[PDB]
Structure 1
Amino acid sequence: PIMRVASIDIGSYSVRLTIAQIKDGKLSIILERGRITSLGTKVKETGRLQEDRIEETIQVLKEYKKLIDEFKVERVKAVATEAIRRAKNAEEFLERVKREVGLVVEVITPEQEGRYAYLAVAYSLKPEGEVCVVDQGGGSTEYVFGKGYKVREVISLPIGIVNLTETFFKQDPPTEEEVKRFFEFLEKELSKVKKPVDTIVGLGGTITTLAALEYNVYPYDPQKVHGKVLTYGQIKKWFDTFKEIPSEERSKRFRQVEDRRAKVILAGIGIFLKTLEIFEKDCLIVSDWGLREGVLVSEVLKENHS
């Protein structure tokens, strides 16, 4: 019989709901919602989640729970990112969610996010041989190694593209020397995760935007992007293109680039370019699915155990 499953992901910017049906082993997404609640507001400065952001987040979660109830979702898993954990009143916020929404939200590590993203790829792409999933987003890039559905090792590198951009790219766009320093740093960090692999799979907003650009996909359509290959050469040419374009012009020239990602996209592209160089691989496969969908996969595997 068909079963419905759902995931909720609470980040520093948005709270997101994904509902899927599973029918003869096939997962199809049937509902998605997203609301920006900016839970990370002033956490760096005050060490705390702000009350107005908590209250809005609780109201969104109530609305998501109403949908889960009406849609008769049988399995629900809710997670929060380590950026929420950074806050000092996170535990008190999560207790309110238990009491007022009826939902447990698990604070998960970046490594665990990687483990879920890896499951998404295992299901949605079935990559062969020794696999490394490279998941860039939310302040980090995870490198998740395994074979089939089995994760062997996950390494999370805290090389967030906002920080890399601010650190290295003092000009907009950066000078050639700034680009050089950025790559020297990435060589230092990425050489530590290098392992022999058969297949690299790339995830996140940077790489799916790159795939849409390379393959002339507009508007964005996951069916046209998921499973596309990008070679080192293709990624290098996009890096070289964006390094010559001021950030404010990028979304004007290339419509698929979101305004809010336009400045940091170059750093993102560099992570993937240097990754391919260091791992000595000529290409990667793009996934449209990651954490949010991997939580759904995990729920299906749990249902089928025993």
Structure 2
Amino acid sequence: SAKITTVIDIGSNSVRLAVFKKTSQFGFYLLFETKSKVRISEGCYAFNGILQEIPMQRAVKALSEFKEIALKYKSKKILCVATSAVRDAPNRLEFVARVKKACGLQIKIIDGQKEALYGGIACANLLHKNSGITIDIGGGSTECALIEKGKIKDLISLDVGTIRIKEMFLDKDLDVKLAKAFIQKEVSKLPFKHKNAFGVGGTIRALSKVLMKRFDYPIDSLHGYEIDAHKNLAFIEKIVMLKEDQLRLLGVNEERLDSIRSGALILSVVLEHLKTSLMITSGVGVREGVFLSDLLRNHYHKFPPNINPSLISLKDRFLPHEKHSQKVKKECVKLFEALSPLHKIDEKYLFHLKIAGELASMGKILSVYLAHKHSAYFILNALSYGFSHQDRAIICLLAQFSHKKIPKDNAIAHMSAMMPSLLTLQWLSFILSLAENLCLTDSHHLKYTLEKNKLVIHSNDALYLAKEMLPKLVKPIPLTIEFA
């Protein structure tokens, strides 16, 4: 296993490259990513899958430069897989040899089961829910993996894809009704159902962006975006029939216009069949699954319990000294417990409080001025694997507003109907703030009790600075705070 690993995926629509960098045993992050839409499948579907010359030439040229990029980052391992368009191709051996000849890259053609597995491995490890069904919609095929509690159960690969449907129906000028009936037949082959889906791939990313723009969503990242599938199913169905200009007005990018409608059609049929309630947009897929297969060597390729690669790598990069963050987290927990009779907050939020406690001072790596704002910025933007947007929102807010009143008008606080109340957020940010004050100095054996409305801080230390600072805390409710 290597410190710098490049994974290249040759799909039916585009070729894509990811460079992953190890920061610790389980910590890693995505160092670089790029894609080229070479559409190697262009014109092949009428030819019984034979890859056409011009598309093959485009693919070779892109892949040669992907090799250059891999070497630029000094990758010690370079892994290359090819999916539906290449595996289906009668001339696949010719194409593989041409790439090896030009680029030195050895393509591993993977079957649909393996493709579904790699997607499943990524989603089972890197999302904020571990039970659900992946939906990976590509140009030539669509894969679903059923995951139960982090374990891959079943796999299905279907030959329906955005470009396949485009070229066999929407080009030959067969009605949308015909395309739909054909997709429905293939989708009937999926035996399972689940409330959760993990959306994988470019079609689903593009459609996610459409919904974010349509609804004025406050958060920029794609990974961990939660879509109400029922609520949005009709609109996804409507996209199928839109003109390209209507797609442009929804913010669809120029290169996405020609495949997004067949993609929406496949997605709508699949969601309906799986009986999906929640779709999580996944920024991860086959490339991550290939990397995780190489990173984690044990039978199922799973992270050990309570190991999060994104939280770990964030600390590796920006917080290599862990003592202070740990102590603040510990006092946050003790304070939350002592104050629980007053606040009555659901213990599920201890998850968010603990991580805010660890990361609140991360932003000092940038500047002392507005350090908490910077931590929040880092949290919202860089804490990805294993966290929902809602998770990041709560954590970001606790840090950002430390020693401050949270405004009634904050957009992130309102990002969903399921967000905690302002009062809950203020409680949690207050607890973090007081923990920070108490942990400023070298202070051991802190203990907290609640006597009536009164929080009592027990310490053997003088705590001079913490006493001085007490009036600058913003309390969620009037609360008497005393030092024994």
- TM-score tier, shorter chain, comes to 0.7 to 0.9
* 1:228-247 pair list within 5 angstroms: 228-239=225-236, 241-242=238-239, 245=242, 247=243
Residues 150, 206 of structure 1: CA spacing in aligned structure 2 closer, same or farther, 3 A cutoff?
Answer: same
The answer as to whether partners of 2:2 and 2:77 remain within 8 angstroms in 1 is no
After superposition, give the CA deviation of every residue in 1:37-96 in whole Å (9 maximum; x if it has no partner): 454455454975556655554444343333333422122210122312344443234234
Cα shift at 1:230 = 1.5
Partner of 1:259: 254
Structure 1 spans left out of the alignment, 5+ residues: none
Unaligned runs of at least 5 residues, structure 2: 302-484
* Structure 1 counterpart SS, 2:199: strand
Alignment counterpart, residue 227 of structure 1, candidates 224, 227, 234:
224
Tell me the residue number matched to 2:9.
9
Cα 1:263/1:101, change in 2 over 3 Å: closer
Aligned-partner residue type, residue 82 of structure 2: A
Q: How does 1:38-53 map to 2 (within 5 A)?
A: 38-41=39-42, 43=44, 44-45=46-47, 49=51
Question: What is the one-letter code of the residue matched to 1:112?
Answer: K
Q: 1:269 aligns with which of 253, 261, 264?
A: 264
Aligned to 1:33: 34
TM-score when normalising by structure 1: 0.78
Aligned to 1:64: 66
- Cα 1:6–1:302 change in 2 (3 A) is farther
Distance in 2 (alpha carbons) for counterparts of 1:158 and 1:145: 18
The amino acid that maps onto 2:227 is: L
Residue number among 124, 127, 130 corresponding to 1:128 in the alignment: 130
Distance in 2 separating the partners of 1:117 and 1:40: 21
Matched residue, 2:117: 115
The Cα of 1:8 is off from its aligned counterpart by 1.2
**TM-score between both structures, scaled by the size of structure 2:** 0.52
Does residue 209 of structure 2 align to residue 212 of structure 1?
yes
Query: Aligned-residue CA RMSD in angstroms?
Result: 3.8
Distance in structure 2 (CA, Å) of the matches to 1:77 and 1:187: 35
Shift in Å, 1:154: 1.3
CA, structure 1 residues 262+34, in 2 after alignment: closer, same or farther (shift >3 Å)? closer
Query: Structure 1 residue 239: deviation in Å?
Result: 2.9
Give the deviation of 1:302 after TM superposition.
4.1
SS at match of 2:221: helix
Alignment of 1:187-198 (within 5 A): 187-198=184-195
**Matches of 2:141 and 2:48, distance apart in 1:** 22
Q: Work out which of the two has the higher radius of gyration on C-alpha atoms and give 1 or 2.
A: 2
Distance 2:166 2:53 in 1: 31
Contact 2:119 / 2:285 at 8 angstroms: preserved in 1? yes
- Tell whether 2:245 aligns with 1:249: yes
Q: Per the alignment, do residues 187 and 15 of structure 1 end up closer, same or farther by CA in structure 2, a change over 3 Å counting? A: closer
Counterpart check, 1:290 vs 2:285: yes
Paired positions, count: 297
Overall identity of the aligned pairs, in % = 29
- Kindly provide the amino acid, as one letter, of the partner of residue 147 in structure 2: G
Counterpart residue identity of residue 301, structure 1: L
Cα separation, partners in 2 of 1:295 and 1:221, compared to 1, 3 Å: farther
* Pair 1:137 & 2:133 matched: no
- State how 1:153-172 maps to structure 2 within 5 Å: 153-164=154-165
**Alpha carbons of structure 1 residues 213 and 60: separation in structure 2 relative to 1, 3 Å:** closer
Deviation of 1:160 after TM superposition, in Å, equals: 2.3
Q: Structure 1 169/96 Cα, relative in aligned 2: closer, same or farther at 3 Å?
A: closer
Structure 1 5/281 Cα, relative in aligned 2: closer, same or farther at 3 Å?
Answer: same
Structure showing the higher strand proportion among its residues:
1
CA distance 1:30–1:151, change in 2 (3 Å): same
Query: What amino acid maps onto 1:193 in structure 2?
Result: L
Query: Structure 2 vs 1, CA of residues 223 and 297 (structure 1 numbering), >3 Å: closer, same or farther?
Result: farther
State whether residues 251 and 259 of structure 1, in contact with CA within 8 Å, keep that contact through their aligned partners in structure 2. no
Matched, 1:76 2:70: no
What secondary structure, in the 3-state scheme, does the structure 2 residue paired with 1:259 have?
coil
Kept in 1: contact 2:117–2:155 (CA 8 A): yes
Using a 3 Å threshold, how does the CA distance of structure 1 residues 45 and 121 change in structure 2: closer, same or farther? same
Note closer, same or farther for the CA distance 1:111–1:206 as it changes in structure 2 (3 Å cut): same
TM-superposed CA distance for 1:201, in Å, is 1.2
Report the equivalent of 2:325.
Answer: none
Cα 1:222–1:65 shift into 2, 3 Å: farther
SS of residue matched to 2:290: helix
